[PDB]
């Protein structure tokens, strides 16, 4: 159930697109591994980087509590 | 950057002098000087009341503007930076567009040619003065008044600064140079930046002579005296203290707190100094 499949064209570099980016975050707020995002090495590197910017803008969490 | 000497005398070996690099004008404004009447540490009864003072170089007093709220809104150009024998900071000559000229203590980074201004609407920039309440929390500041309109009392020595830590109603919380945490009324003026000549504390006097030039006469130990003179006086040969170390007047001098307990400002002091 790899996240990259559930989306069409998106900008790997768009740090404002909270809606797309929040897909690549686990339920605990963490950045998802390649095995969940289906991204290549090169694309994952861009994803991580723009996720971190979005967190600094306040658009994505750094962490979330885990509900059971 | 303090200036060193080659050891071509026993004293030049250790002596260091300020480099005087920020200084652009070597003569004071004639209309802003008045004679400094030397006291020798004597009061109006003629008595020594602070020991070991006198005999230092002649000095003229430079009138310093410690108000600033005096000329709100009126910008001034920094005309020069000068030496002031009466304080550790350097001083900066201001030419107000008014035509009025005054001195302030020179902040770190102040440039001749630059413009400064005082008031609630002043930009937050080195050399400008504002009431504390309009200065952003976190900015480091100097020449701080303690009570509104009474004049700058705080952080005036070379290299010193206070930092705005927060706000609480009519007051703002400062970290003083000493590390003391204190409320100061928001209407108190301060000047953004730190006091300049930060290298002041690295100067090595080098020889007894240099202290004399400064008006500091030799300090003599209580242990070097006789019992008529001092608690530590007397004893055959050298002697240890033989009692709690004391002042010439008998009060203890290692730890004994001396600030008055029931002082009204205690309500405004949040945390006593560090270190």
């Amino acid at each position: 159930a790899k996240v990259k499949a559930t989306l069409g064209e998106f900008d790997l570099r768009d740090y404002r697109n909270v809606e797309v980016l929040k897909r690549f975050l686990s339920e605990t707020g963490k950045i998802l591994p390649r095995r969940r995002t289906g991204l290549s090495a090169k694309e994952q590197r861009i994803l991580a980087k723009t996720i971190k910017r979005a967190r600094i803008l306040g658009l994505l969490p750094f962490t979330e509590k885990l509900v059971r | 950057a303090v200036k060193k000497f080659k050891p071509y005398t026993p004293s030049r070996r250790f002596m260091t002098v300020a480099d005087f690099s920020e200084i652009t004008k070597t003569e004071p404004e004639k209309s802003l000087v008045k004679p400094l009447k030397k006291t020798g540490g004597r009061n109006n009864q003629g008595r020594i009341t602070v020991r070991f003072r006198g005999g230092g170089h002649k000095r003229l007093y430079r009138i310093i503007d410690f108000k600033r709220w005096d000329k709100v809104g009126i910008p001034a150009k920094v005309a020069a930076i000068e030496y002031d024998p009466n304080r550790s900071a350097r001083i900066a000559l201001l030419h107000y567009v008014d035509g009025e000229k005054r001195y302030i203590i020179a902040p770190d980074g102040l440039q001749v040619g630059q413009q400064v201004v005082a008031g609630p609407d002043a930009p937050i920039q080195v050399g400008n003065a504002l009431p504390l309440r309009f200065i952003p929390v976190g900015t480091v500041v100097h020449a701080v008044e303690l009570e509104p309109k009474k004049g700058a009392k705080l952080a005036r020595a070379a290299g010193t600064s206070a930092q705005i830590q927060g706000r609480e109603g009519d007051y703002v919380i400062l970290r003083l140079p000493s590390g003391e945490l204190r409320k100061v009324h928001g209407e108190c003026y301060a000047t953004v930046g730190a006091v300049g000549n930060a290298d002041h504390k690295n100067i090595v006097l080098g020889k007894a002579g240099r202290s004399r030039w400064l008006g500091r006469r030799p300090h003599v130990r209580g242990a070097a005296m006789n019992p008529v003179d001092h608690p530590h006086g007397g004893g055959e040969g050298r002697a240890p203290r033989g009692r709690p170390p004391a002042s010439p007047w008998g009060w203890q001098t290692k730890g004994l707190k001396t600030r008055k307990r029931r002082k009204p400002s205690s309500r405004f002091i949040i945390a006593r100094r560090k270190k």
């Binding site: 750094f62 962490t63 509590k65 885990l66 509900v67 059971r68 | -």
Partner: protein
Amino acid sequence: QVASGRAYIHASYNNTIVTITDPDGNPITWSSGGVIGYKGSRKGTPYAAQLAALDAAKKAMAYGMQSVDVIVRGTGAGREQAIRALQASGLQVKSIVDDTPVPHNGCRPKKKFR
């Protein structure tokens, strides 16, 4: 008296501490491996947590408490059993969340964690 509140489970390898609060987060009661009577390493056992969670729940219900939200911190052995005991106590356990503190690589840990 508070009908709803929170249950905090501080569970370490050495002990389990349970403190029931009000909805604002202010403690009404608390209990632990020490309170129900254990000393030493015994306080870190699952049974200890069980007695602790119960005694804390019992005390809490005595103030009218009926529902709680369970907040869990720590990787102790007595963890799950405390959660268990809260459920099987007579309180509603409206929710269960782990809020265990984890640094984003802050302070150097003591020697034993390296």
